[PDB]
Short mmCIF file of C-alpha atoms and ligand atoms in Angstrom, two decimals:
data_model
loop_
_atom_site.label_atom_id
_atom_site.label_comp_id
_atom_site.label_asym_id
_atom_site.label_seq_id
_atom_site.Cartn_x
_atom_site.Cartn_y
_atom_site.Cartn_z
CA UNK A 2 -80.30 -1.58 73.97
CA UNK A 3 -81.38 -0.87 77.73
CA UNK A 4 -82.16 -3.79 79.34
CA UNK A 5 -79.35 -6.75 80.03
CA UNK A 6 -79.55 -10.60 80.51
CA UNK A 7 -76.23 -11.06 81.24
CA UNK A 8 -76.31 -10.20 85.37
CA UNK A 9 -78.86 -12.26 86.05
CA UNK A 10 -76.63 -15.62 85.30
CA UNK A 11 -74.49 -17.74 87.31
CA UNK A 12 -76.21 -16.54 90.69
CA UNK A 13 -75.89 -19.06 93.37
CA UNK A 14 -77.89 -18.98 96.38
CA UNK A 15 -78.88 -20.65 99.06
CA UNK A 16 -82.79 -19.65 100.19
CA UNK A 17 -84.94 -19.83 102.44
CA UNK A 18 -88.50 -19.02 100.88
CA UNK A 19 -90.02 -19.30 104.09
CA UNK A 20 -90.43 -15.19 105.17
CA UNK A 21 -88.55 -14.02 101.72
CA UNK A 22 -88.68 -10.85 100.42
CA UNK A 23 -88.07 -9.88 96.60
CA UNK A 24 -87.93 -6.22 97.42
CA UNK A 25 -85.27 -5.25 99.73
CA UNK A 26 -85.08 -1.76 99.51
CA UNK A 27 -88.02 0.55 100.86
CA UNK A 28 -90.60 2.47 99.61
CA UNK A 29 -88.56 6.02 99.32
CA UNK A 30 -85.66 4.07 97.81
CA UNK A 31 -88.14 3.07 95.08
CA UNK A 32 -89.28 6.31 94.71
CA UNK A 33 -85.75 7.77 94.03
CA UNK A 34 -84.83 4.72 91.65
CA UNK A 35 -88.26 5.39 89.42
CA UNK A 36 -87.93 9.07 89.36
CA UNK A 37 -83.97 9.99 89.42
CA UNK A 38 -82.69 6.85 88.62
CA UNK A 39 -79.14 9.07 87.59
CA UNK A 40 -78.72 11.54 91.01
CA UNK A 41 -81.00 9.82 93.37
CA UNK A 42 -82.37 13.17 94.67
CA UNK A 43 -86.49 13.25 93.61
CA UNK A 44 -86.70 16.41 96.37
CA UNK A 45 -84.75 18.43 93.99
CA UNK A 46 -87.18 18.18 91.09
CA UNK A 47 -89.64 21.08 89.94
CA UNK A 48 -93.26 21.04 91.71
CA UNK A 49 -94.38 19.36 88.42
CA UNK A 50 -92.78 16.33 89.22
CA UNK A 51 -92.99 16.19 92.93
CA UNK A 52 -97.07 16.37 93.01
CA UNK A 53 -96.77 13.22 91.70
CA UNK A 54 -94.86 11.09 94.26
CA UNK A 55 -97.74 10.01 96.35
CA UNK A 56 -99.45 8.35 93.48
CA UNK A 57 -96.21 6.56 92.71
CA UNK A 58 -95.43 5.78 96.55
CA UNK A 59 -98.76 4.31 97.36
CA UNK A 60 -98.84 2.22 94.19
CA UNK A 61 -94.75 0.98 95.25
CA UNK A 62 -96.04 0.46 98.68
CA UNK A 63 -99.13 -1.99 97.86
CA UNK A 64 -96.21 -3.77 95.65
CA UNK A 65 -93.70 -3.64 98.90
CA UNK A 66 -96.94 -4.94 101.14
CA UNK A 67 -97.84 -7.92 98.62
CA UNK A 68 -94.36 -8.62 98.58
CA UNK A 69 -94.26 -9.05 102.31
CA UNK A 70 -97.67 -10.57 102.16
CA UNK A 71 -96.51 -13.39 99.30
CA UNK A 72 -95.73 -17.01 100.44
CA UNK A 73 -92.79 -17.97 98.02
CA UNK A 74 -92.14 -21.03 100.36
CA UNK A 75 -95.45 -22.22 99.13
CA UNK A 76 -95.29 -21.58 95.69
CA UNK A 77 -91.77 -23.07 95.69
CA UNK A 78 -93.52 -26.26 97.22
CA UNK A 79 -95.89 -26.19 94.30
CA UNK A 80 -94.08 -25.53 91.43
CA UNK A 81 -90.24 -26.04 91.49
CA UNK A 82 -90.02 -28.76 94.37
CA UNK A 83 -89.69 -31.82 92.08
CA UNK A 84 -88.50 -33.22 95.20
CA UNK A 85 -87.54 -36.94 93.46
CA UNK A 86 -83.84 -37.90 94.32
CA UNK A 87 -83.47 -39.93 91.76
CA UNK A 88 -80.60 -39.43 89.07
CA UNK A 89 -80.85 -38.56 85.34
CA UNK A 90 -78.33 -39.40 82.37
CA UNK A 91 -77.82 -35.35 81.17
CA UNK A 92 -77.04 -32.68 83.79
CA UNK A 93 -79.72 -30.15 81.61
CA UNK A 94 -82.82 -32.60 82.48
CA UNK A 95 -82.29 -31.46 86.09
CA UNK A 96 -83.44 -27.82 85.21
CA UNK A 97 -86.60 -25.83 85.21
CA UNK A 98 -88.34 -26.51 81.93
CA UNK A 99 -88.61 -22.63 80.04
CA UNK A 100 -92.40 -22.90 80.35
CA UNK A 101 -92.72 -23.77 83.57
CA UNK A 102 -90.34 -20.30 84.70
CA UNK A 103 -92.39 -18.34 82.99
CA UNK A 104 -95.24 -19.40 84.45
CA UNK A 105 -93.58 -19.23 88.12
CA UNK A 106 -91.84 -16.11 86.82
CA UNK A 107 -95.96 -14.37 85.70
CA UNK A 108 -97.17 -15.41 88.63
CA UNK A 109 -95.08 -14.09 91.14
CA UNK A 110 -95.51 -10.83 89.42
CA UNK A 111 -99.59 -11.46 89.57
CA UNK A 112 -99.22 -11.57 93.23
CA UNK A 113 -96.75 -8.69 93.59
CA UNK A 114 -98.53 -6.05 90.73
CA UNK A 115 -102.35 -4.95 91.02
CA UNK A 116 -103.85 -4.60 88.00
CA UNK A 117 -103.62 -0.83 88.16
CA UNK A 118 -99.95 -1.32 89.01
CA UNK A 119 -100.18 -2.82 85.57
CA UNK A 120 -101.61 -0.40 83.61
CA UNK A 121 -104.83 -2.06 83.28
CA UNK A 122 -105.93 -5.03 81.40
CA UNK A 123 -104.70 -4.25 77.98
CA UNK A 124 -101.19 -3.69 78.80
CA UNK A 125 -100.64 -6.19 81.55
CA UNK A 126 -101.16 -8.18 78.65
CA UNK A 127 -98.12 -6.49 76.94
CA UNK A 128 -96.20 -6.13 79.58
CA UNK A 129 -96.40 -9.80 80.16
CA UNK A 130 -95.01 -10.59 76.87
CA UNK A 131 -92.17 -8.86 77.25
CA UNK A 132 -91.34 -10.13 80.55
CA UNK A 133 -91.57 -13.90 78.67
CA UNK A 134 -88.89 -12.20 75.84
CA UNK A 135 -86.84 -11.18 78.54
CA UNK A 136 -86.71 -14.77 79.98
CA UNK A 137 -85.96 -16.09 76.26
CA UNK A 138 -83.07 -13.63 76.14
CA UNK A 139 -79.40 -14.99 75.69
CA UNK A 140 -76.66 -14.71 77.74
CA UNK A 141 -75.71 -11.72 75.47
CA UNK A 142 -78.48 -10.16 74.33
CA UNK A 143 -80.43 -7.70 75.72
CA UNK A 144 -83.88 -5.78 74.99
CA UNK A 145 -85.21 -1.99 74.56
CA UNK A 146 -86.99 0.22 77.01
CA UNK A 147 -88.21 1.59 74.20
CA UNK A 148 -89.60 -2.02 72.72
CA UNK A 149 -91.10 -2.37 75.44
CA UNK A 150 -93.04 0.73 75.77
CA UNK A 151 -94.18 0.53 71.63
CA UNK A 152 -96.95 -1.63 72.80
CA UNK A 153 -97.98 0.43 76.04
CA UNK A 154 -100.80 2.76 76.14
CA UNK A 155 -99.55 5.43 78.43
CA UNK A 156 -103.45 7.31 79.45
CA UNK A 157 -103.80 3.65 81.06
CA UNK A 158 -101.32 4.50 84.04
CA UNK A 159 -104.06 6.93 85.79
CA UNK A 160 -101.22 7.07 88.92
CA UNK A 161 -98.68 8.81 86.00
CA UNK A 169 -95.61 20.29 75.95
CA UNK A 170 -97.59 21.01 78.50
CA UNK A 171 -94.46 19.42 80.63
CA UNK A 172 -97.16 16.89 82.04
CA UNK A 173 -97.14 14.87 79.26
CA UNK A 174 -93.22 14.77 78.76
CA UNK A 175 -93.13 13.69 82.92
CA UNK A 176 -95.56 11.46 82.29
CA UNK A 177 -93.52 9.02 79.81
CA UNK A 178 -89.95 9.79 82.13
CA UNK A 179 -91.79 8.53 85.35
CA UNK A 180 -93.32 5.28 82.82
CA UNK A 181 -89.50 4.50 81.63
CA UNK A 182 -88.23 4.80 85.24
CA UNK A 183 -91.30 2.48 86.58
CA UNK A 184 -91.33 0.12 83.60
CA UNK A 185 -87.35 -0.07 84.40
CA UNK A 186 -87.64 -0.62 87.96
CA UNK A 187 -90.09 -3.80 87.51
CA UNK A 188 -87.38 -5.39 84.76
CA UNK A 189 -84.06 -4.16 86.49
CA UNK A 190 -85.45 -4.61 90.08
CA UNK A 191 -88.35 -7.24 90.64
CA UNK A 192 -87.99 -9.43 87.02
CA UNK A 193 -84.14 -9.67 87.84
CA UNK A 194 -84.31 -10.44 91.60
CA UNK A 195 -87.30 -13.04 90.90
CA UNK A 196 -84.99 -15.21 88.41
CA UNK A 197 -82.10 -14.38 91.06
CA UNK A 198 -84.06 -16.03 93.65
CA UNK A 199 -85.13 -19.52 91.99
CA UNK A 200 -82.56 -19.83 89.90
CA UNK A 201 -78.63 -20.43 89.08
CA UNK A 202 -78.49 -19.54 85.53
CA UNK A 203 -76.23 -20.69 82.52
CA UNK A 204 -75.32 -21.94 79.57
CA UNK A 205 -74.53 -25.43 78.77
CA UNK A 206 -71.00 -26.55 76.75
CA UNK A 207 -73.34 -26.85 73.85
CA UNK A 208 -71.63 -23.92 72.17
CA UNK A 209 -75.09 -21.86 71.30
CA UNK A 210 -75.07 -18.63 74.46
CA UNK A 211 -78.40 -18.05 73.48
CA UNK A 212 -79.94 -21.24 75.10
CA UNK A 213 -80.15 -20.61 78.87
CA UNK A 214 -80.63 -23.21 81.66
CA UNK A 215 -82.63 -22.31 85.04
CA UNK A 216 -81.73 -24.83 87.91
CA UNK A 217 -82.91 -24.36 90.96
CA UNK A 218 -80.76 -23.58 93.38
CA UNK A 219 -81.19 -26.67 95.28
CA UNK A 220 -80.64 -29.15 93.09
CA UNK A 221 -77.73 -26.97 91.47
CA UNK A 222 -75.59 -26.60 95.09
CA UNK A 223 -76.30 -30.75 94.96
CA UNK A 224 -75.09 -31.39 91.86
CA UNK A 225 -72.52 -28.72 92.04
CA UNK A 226 -70.68 -29.80 95.50
CA UNK A 227 -70.60 -33.73 94.43
CA UNK A 228 -69.10 -32.87 91.42
CA UNK A 229 -66.40 -30.39 93.16
CA UNK A 230 -65.89 -33.19 95.83
CA UNK A 231 -65.39 -35.71 93.29
CA UNK A 232 -62.80 -33.42 90.98
CA UNK A 233 -60.82 -32.13 93.73
CA UNK A 234 -59.62 -35.43 94.93
CA UNK A 235 -58.07 -35.95 91.77
CA UNK A 236 -57.02 -33.04 90.89
CA UNK A 237 -56.93 -30.25 93.31
CA UNK A 238 -55.42 -29.82 96.54
CA UNK A 239 -56.84 -27.53 99.31
CA UNK A 240 -54.59 -24.25 100.62
CA UNK A 241 -54.87 -22.50 103.41
CA UNK A 242 -51.91 -20.02 102.14
CA UNK A 243 -52.61 -17.66 99.75
CA UNK A 248 -48.89 -12.22 89.39
CA UNK A 249 -52.50 -12.86 88.40
CA UNK A 250 -53.00 -16.76 89.32
CA UNK A 251 -56.25 -16.34 91.12
CA UNK A 252 -59.61 -17.68 89.78
CA UNK A 253 -63.02 -18.52 90.63
CA UNK A 254 -64.59 -21.75 89.75
CA UNK A 255 -67.56 -21.97 87.24
CA UNK A 256 -69.21 -25.18 86.15
CA UNK A 257 -70.76 -25.45 83.13
CA UNK A 258 -73.25 -28.75 82.51
CA UNK A 259 -71.40 -31.21 79.84
CA UNK A 260 -74.01 -34.14 79.07
CA UNK A 261 -73.07 -36.74 82.01
CA UNK A 262 -71.18 -34.34 83.51
CA UNK A 263 -69.81 -30.83 84.32
CA UNK A 264 -66.97 -28.47 82.31
CA UNK A 265 -64.40 -27.35 85.01
CA UNK A 266 -63.93 -23.47 84.07
CA UNK A 267 -61.70 -21.36 86.49
CA UNK A 268 -63.00 -17.49 85.36
CA UNK A 269 -59.40 -15.45 86.40
CA UNK A 270 -59.84 -12.84 89.02
CA UNK A 271 -59.14 -9.01 87.45
CA UNK A 272 -57.78 -8.23 91.48
CA UNK A 273 -55.98 -9.93 94.25
CA UNK A 274 -57.29 -11.54 96.73
CA UNK A 275 -57.83 -8.85 99.04
CA UNK A 276 -59.89 -6.89 96.96
CA UNK A 277 -61.84 -9.68 95.88
CA UNK A 278 -62.67 -11.12 99.71
CA UNK A 279 -63.97 -7.46 101.22
CA UNK A 280 -67.38 -6.56 99.31
CA UNK A 281 -67.06 -2.63 97.90
CA UNK A 282 -63.43 -1.34 98.62
CA UNK A 283 -63.21 0.77 96.06
CA UNK A 284 -59.77 2.71 96.84
CA UNK A 285 -58.71 -1.29 94.75
CA UNK A 286 -60.72 -1.33 92.31
CA UNK A 287 -60.45 1.71 90.00
CA UNK A 288 -56.25 1.69 90.93
CA UNK A 289 -56.40 -2.40 90.60
CA UNK A 290 -58.16 -2.45 87.12
CA UNK A 291 -54.66 -0.56 85.66
CA UNK A 292 -52.46 -2.85 87.44
CA UNK A 293 -54.76 -5.70 85.38
CA UNK A 294 -54.43 -3.55 82.33
CA UNK A 295 -50.44 -3.31 82.67
CA UNK A 296 -49.69 -7.31 83.22
CA UNK A 297 -52.16 -8.11 80.14
CA UNK A 298 -50.96 -5.46 77.80
CA UNK A 299 -47.36 -5.36 78.48
CA UNK A 300 -47.03 -8.92 80.14
CA UNK A 301 -49.39 -11.52 79.48
CA UNK A 302 -49.71 -10.70 75.81
CA UNK A 303 -46.03 -10.50 74.90
CA UNK A 304 -45.84 -14.05 76.54
CA UNK A 305 -48.17 -15.24 74.67
CA UNK A 306 -47.29 -13.95 71.14
CA UNK A 307 -43.73 -14.73 71.39
CA UNK A 308 -45.04 -18.50 72.79
CA UNK A 309 -46.79 -18.68 69.71
CA UNK A 310 -44.47 -17.58 67.04
CA UNK A 311 -41.70 -19.78 68.56
CA UNK A 312 -44.71 -22.71 67.58
CA UNK A 313 -44.65 -21.10 64.37
CA UNK A 314 -41.41 -21.51 63.85
CA UNK A 315 -41.21 -24.76 64.56
CA UNK A 316 -44.70 -25.72 62.26
CA UNK A 317 -42.43 -24.42 59.38
CA UNK A 318 -39.04 -26.28 60.46
CA UNK A 319 -40.30 -29.84 62.17
CA UNK A 320 -43.00 -32.48 60.73
CA UNK A 321 -43.88 -32.90 64.54
CA UNK A 322 -45.34 -29.96 64.92
CA UNK A 323 -46.74 -29.54 61.56
CA UNK A 324 -49.34 -32.26 62.62
CA UNK A 325 -51.00 -29.59 64.60
CA UNK A 326 -54.45 -28.32 63.12
CA UNK A 327 -56.89 -25.75 64.58
CA UNK A 328 -60.10 -26.33 62.57
CA UNK A 329 -62.78 -28.91 61.16
CA UNK A 330 -62.05 -27.60 57.78
CA UNK A 331 -57.98 -27.42 58.21
CA UNK A 332 -58.82 -31.25 58.71
CA UNK A 333 -60.16 -31.77 55.28
CA UNK A 334 -57.78 -29.67 53.63
CA UNK A 335 -54.60 -31.34 54.54
CA UNK A 336 -56.55 -34.76 54.22
CA UNK A 337 -57.37 -34.07 50.01
CA UNK A 338 -53.49 -32.82 50.16
CA UNK A 339 -52.31 -35.83 51.43
CA UNK A 340 -54.76 -37.70 49.12
CA UNK A 341 -53.13 -35.55 46.13
CA UNK A 342 -49.44 -36.63 47.08
CA UNK A 343 -50.50 -40.57 47.20
CA UNK A 344 -51.66 -39.49 43.67
CA UNK A 345 -48.41 -38.44 42.27
CA UNK A 346 -46.40 -41.58 43.67
CA UNK A 347 -49.20 -44.04 42.78
CA UNK A 348 -50.97 -43.24 40.03
CA UNK A 349 -53.96 -44.82 41.83
CA UNK A 350 -55.43 -45.21 45.16
CA UNK A 351 -53.45 -48.39 47.28
CA UNK A 352 -54.95 -49.78 50.33
CA UNK A 353 -55.02 -47.23 53.14
CA UNK A 354 -55.26 -47.79 56.73
CA UNK A 355 -57.07 -45.34 59.47
CA UNK A 356 -57.12 -45.07 63.04
CA UNK A 357 -58.55 -42.44 65.39
CA UNK A 358 -57.99 -42.29 69.54
CA UNK A 359 -57.96 -39.50 71.64
CA UNK A 360 -56.54 -38.52 75.14
CA UNK A 361 -58.55 -38.52 78.49
CA UNK A 362 -58.72 -35.42 79.74
CA UNK A 363 -56.10 -33.63 78.29
CA UNK A 364 -55.97 -30.42 80.44
CA UNK A 365 -56.61 -32.07 83.83
CA UNK A 366 -54.11 -34.87 83.29
CA UNK A 367 -51.38 -32.68 81.58
CA UNK A 368 -47.72 -33.85 83.12
CA UNK A 369 -46.67 -30.31 84.43
CA UNK A 370 -42.77 -31.35 84.47
CA UNK A 371 -43.09 -32.25 81.34
CA UNK A 372 -44.35 -29.27 80.14
CA UNK A 373 -41.67 -27.22 81.83
CA UNK A 374 -39.56 -29.26 79.71
CA UNK A 375 -41.08 -28.45 76.35
CA UNK A 376 -41.43 -24.65 77.31
CA UNK A 377 -37.52 -24.80 77.85
CA UNK A 378 -37.12 -26.90 75.01
CA UNK A 379 -38.67 -24.60 72.02
CA UNK A 380 -36.17 -21.52 73.90
CA UNK A 381 -33.09 -24.23 73.76
CA UNK A 382 -31.39 -21.67 70.85
CA UNK A 383 -31.63 -18.94 73.12
CA UNK A 384 -29.33 -17.97 75.62
CA UNK A 385 -30.59 -16.57 78.96
CA UNK A 386 -30.46 -12.61 77.98
CA UNK A 387 -32.27 -12.85 74.95
CA UNK A 388 -34.43 -10.58 74.21
CA UNK A 389 -37.58 -10.43 71.99
CA UNK A 390 -39.92 -7.91 70.26
CA UNK A 391 -43.44 -7.88 69.01
CA UNK A 392 -46.65 -5.57 67.34
CA UNK A 443 -42.84 -2.39 69.51
CA UNK A 444 -43.53 -4.21 73.11
CA UNK A 445 -39.92 -6.06 74.55
CA UNK A 446 -40.09 -9.05 76.82
CA UNK A 447 -37.23 -11.01 77.44
CA UNK A 448 -37.08 -15.02 77.84
CA UNK A 449 -35.97 -15.37 81.51
CA UNK A 450 -39.82 -13.25 82.04
CA UNK A 451 -41.09 -15.45 79.68
CA UNK A 452 -40.27 -18.58 81.95
CA UNK A 453 -41.18 -16.69 85.20
CA UNK A 454 -44.22 -16.06 84.00
CA UNK A 455 -45.17 -19.50 82.52
CA UNK A 456 -43.76 -21.13 85.85
CA UNK A 457 -46.18 -19.09 87.52
CA UNK A 458 -49.11 -19.69 85.54
CA UNK A 459 -48.14 -23.67 86.19
CA UNK A 460 -47.41 -23.62 89.54
CA UNK A 461 -49.11 -21.30 91.10
CA UNK A 462 -52.42 -21.30 89.85
CA UNK A 463 -55.29 -20.82 92.37
CA UNK A 464 -59.08 -21.59 92.39
CA UNK A 465 -61.50 -20.51 94.60
CA UNK A 466 -64.59 -22.96 95.24
CA UNK A 467 -67.89 -21.46 96.32
CA UNK A 468 -69.31 -24.29 99.12
CA UNK A 469 -72.43 -25.26 99.98
CA UNK A 470 -72.67 -22.05 102.83
CA UNK A 471 -71.46 -19.28 101.14
CA UNK A 472 -67.88 -19.66 101.80
CA UNK A 473 -64.57 -19.57 99.57
CA UNK A 474 -62.37 -22.54 99.76
CA UNK A 475 -58.72 -22.22 97.78
CA UNK A 476 -57.38 -24.99 95.64
CA UNK A 477 -54.16 -25.37 93.64
CA UNK A 478 -53.79 -28.36 90.87
CA UNK A 479 -52.31 -31.66 91.74
CA UNK A 480 -51.31 -32.09 88.06
CA UNK A 481 -52.36 -30.15 84.63
CA UNK A 482 -53.56 -26.93 83.92
CA UNK A 483 -56.76 -24.95 84.74
CA UNK A 484 -59.25 -24.28 81.93
CA UNK A 485 -59.37 -20.60 81.19
CA UNK A 486 -56.20 -19.36 81.93
CA UNK A 487 -54.94 -17.06 79.57
CA UNK A 488 -51.87 -20.03 78.66
CA UNK A 489 -53.64 -23.40 79.49
CA UNK A 490 -54.22 -23.48 75.24
CA UNK A 491 -51.21 -22.74 74.18
CA UNK A 492 -49.58 -24.80 76.96
CA UNK A 493 -51.35 -27.89 75.70
CA UNK A 494 -49.99 -27.00 72.86
CA UNK A 495 -46.58 -26.91 73.24
CA UNK A 496 -46.92 -30.05 74.80
CA UNK A 497 -48.94 -32.90 72.53
CA UNK A 498 -46.71 -30.89 69.53
CA UNK A 499 -43.55 -31.24 71.60
CA UNK A 500 -44.74 -35.23 72.36
CA UNK A 501 -45.77 -35.81 68.96
CA UNK A 502 -42.80 -34.70 67.22
CA UNK A 503 -40.55 -36.81 69.96
CA UNK A 504 -42.42 -40.20 69.95
CA UNK A 505 -44.25 -40.33 66.48
CA UNK A 506 -40.61 -39.49 65.06
CA UNK A 507 -40.59 -42.96 62.33
CA UNK A 508 -43.48 -40.74 61.19
CA UNK A 509 -41.34 -38.06 59.67
CA UNK A 510 -39.03 -40.30 57.91
CA UNK A 511 -40.46 -40.69 54.01
CA UNK A 512 -43.72 -38.36 55.05
CA UNK A 513 -45.11 -39.27 51.61
CA UNK A 514 -47.04 -42.41 52.73
CA UNK A 515 -48.10 -41.11 56.46
CA UNK A 516 -50.32 -38.80 57.84
CA UNK A 517 -51.10 -37.56 61.36
CA UNK A 518 -53.26 -34.49 62.52
CA UNK A 519 -54.04 -33.09 65.70
CA UNK A 520 -57.49 -31.46 66.78
CA UNK A 521 -56.28 -30.66 69.98
CA UNK A 522 -57.02 -34.05 72.25
CA UNK A 523 -58.46 -35.61 68.87
CA UNK A 524 -55.74 -37.87 66.66
CA UNK A 525 -56.54 -39.03 63.30
CA UNK A 526 -54.08 -41.16 61.29
CA UNK A 527 -53.71 -42.31 57.65
CA UNK A 528 -51.11 -44.73 56.20
CA UNK A 529 -50.52 -46.91 53.09
CA UNK A 530 -47.62 -48.65 55.20
CA UNK A 531 -49.18 -51.76 57.34
CA UNK A 532 -45.77 -51.87 59.29
CA UNK A 533 -46.30 -48.25 59.96
CA UNK A 534 -49.91 -48.70 61.25
CA UNK A 535 -48.51 -51.33 63.75
CA UNK A 536 -45.98 -48.98 64.93
CA UNK A 537 -48.66 -46.32 65.80
CA UNK A 538 -51.02 -49.14 67.07
CA UNK A 539 -48.18 -50.02 69.51
CA UNK A 540 -47.06 -46.40 70.42
CA UNK A 541 -50.85 -45.74 71.82
CA UNK A 542 -51.88 -49.53 73.33
CA UNK A 543 -48.18 -48.99 75.56
CA UNK A 544 -47.98 -46.08 78.74
CA UNK A 545 -45.17 -44.46 76.74
CA UNK A 546 -47.42 -41.21 76.18
CA UNK A 547 -48.47 -41.29 79.68
CA UNK A 548 -45.15 -39.42 80.91
CA UNK A 549 -46.55 -36.17 79.06
CA UNK A 550 -49.82 -36.63 80.68
CA UNK A 551 -51.41 -38.06 77.57
CA UNK A 552 -53.74 -40.99 78.82
CA UNK A 553 -55.46 -42.75 75.59
CA UNK A 554 -58.62 -43.46 75.54
CA UNK A 555 -59.01 -47.10 74.93
CA UNK A 556 -61.98 -46.93 74.52
CA UNK A 557 -62.85 -44.99 72.24
CA UNK A 558 -60.02 -46.01 69.35
CA UNK A 559 -61.65 -46.52 66.23
CA UNK A 560 -59.34 -48.43 63.66
CA UNK A 561 -61.04 -49.30 59.93
CA UNK A 562 -58.85 -49.86 56.52
CA UNK A 563 -59.32 -50.52 52.81
CA UNK A 564 -58.62 -54.49 52.99
CA UNK A 565 -61.97 -55.94 54.87
CA UNK A 566 -64.24 -55.22 57.53
CA UNK A 567 -68.24 -53.82 57.67
CA UNK A 568 -67.36 -50.32 57.28
CA UNK A 569 -64.79 -48.18 55.17
CA UNK A 570 -66.13 -44.57 56.60
CA UNK A 571 -65.05 -43.23 59.88
CA UNK A 572 -65.76 -39.79 61.34
CA UNK A 573 -63.18 -38.07 63.26
CA UNK A 574 -64.28 -33.80 63.66
CA UNK A 575 -67.83 -34.19 62.38
CA UNK A 576 -66.03 -35.38 58.69
CA UNK A 577 -66.87 -37.98 57.14
CA UNK A 578 -63.65 -40.10 55.66
CA UNK A 579 -63.75 -42.52 53.10
CA UNK A 580 -60.67 -44.47 53.76
CA UNK A 581 -61.37 -46.34 50.42
CA UNK A 582 -61.40 -42.62 47.85
CA UNK A 583 -60.47 -40.66 50.73
CA UNK A 584 -63.41 -38.22 49.63
CA UNK A 585 -64.12 -36.19 52.85
CA UNK A 586 -68.05 -34.92 53.33
CA UNK A 587 -69.34 -33.03 56.59
CA UNK A 588 -71.56 -35.16 58.81
NA1 LIG B 1 -89.44 -4.89 101.78
NA1 LIG B 2 -62.83 -51.42 56.28
#
């Protein structure tokens, strides 16, 4: 509940390890952090505390000296160099193994802290185990200080109610806190870019050396920017910071929205903006962005109970199984026994990147077609007009800007050629509006006499089940053509799978981790 892990993540560097220093503060600055972390004025304490300053200063001075003497360039070459420029199949295989991360961190701690700074031999093992625990923490996990101190013998820290034994405790709390916050965290940020994988669990962190991470990220960005981005030398909250997340062979490109303007982000520490800009973002989120996100979702649900075209969009794996079993029971009413069924699954290539912006605007306009320009809406009450919806959506689509941190620590700007950024507040609902509009227009023949046809959309994955072999031909014709490219939906033809119940080497199909039997329509998990 005291020592956090998230603030070591996503730290990109370009370090020179020859003549490198972990501790950037002097001995007096550290003494303030240990003794009075809140006030940062240790001279105000009563003399029972100040008499311990010399013993604390000498220990810190030895740690600071050991830091200046430590040859981190040699430690990197021996343990982290890995100078083998061949390629690997998965990105997380470029990361340093977790055992090697622990070994590097504990070796540096051994070269920084003398035995008496650890509190003796027995306490050194205890603190080392707690350092490993901190390294095993997930992105949203934390470690409590009293958890660390519960295994520490205070009496062994000779350099330091009677009020003597209460001062020793507080000094131990402040010192141990300084070890984790300022030494252990700075060691991690000095050698690794810490991030989580696209494999959902955030409790599994991966540690990439800054040398290999800068090569992998920059190579991917220059590739990705060619087909998706346009550099802007030019400049409501439409700016974001690019964040790459390793995905099996490549990266997932995420644009984390800036909660400030580009001015407050540029300068390091202008505070006269930060506190007031916070309110500008809150009022935009509460009174502009949320009503837009709600009215868009409400209009979508309104077409989710009026038209079959939008009815075909689902949101979870279990929701697919529920609509399939319902489709099975609907067939067991028209036939009294399951007929021969035909199944096909297909998916779109990079639905968010290839999304056609012009067709998206027509879709958003299409769901506000029965309203006048003066129309107003009320949400849980908050007021917002149809025009304000269109204005917010157009700025999110057309004015989206991302910041890419390149090799030398600079910051270049980019807009999108087509598509929408992942991570923006309306990107998901945008893709839902466009794809539902596409399914409602292009697959209109399915919705006539729907008692023998089933189409389901998990956002970029499609499954189609039918008892009509002719209708299966119409669906195969629609996806094999390029008529869906108008919307930016490019069928991934290599992953299009088709099975049916007449014959064939298989009667099973896995779609979202469900295992579907085209004979019985029984669906189990995979
Ligand atoms: Na120093
Ligand atoms: Na088959």
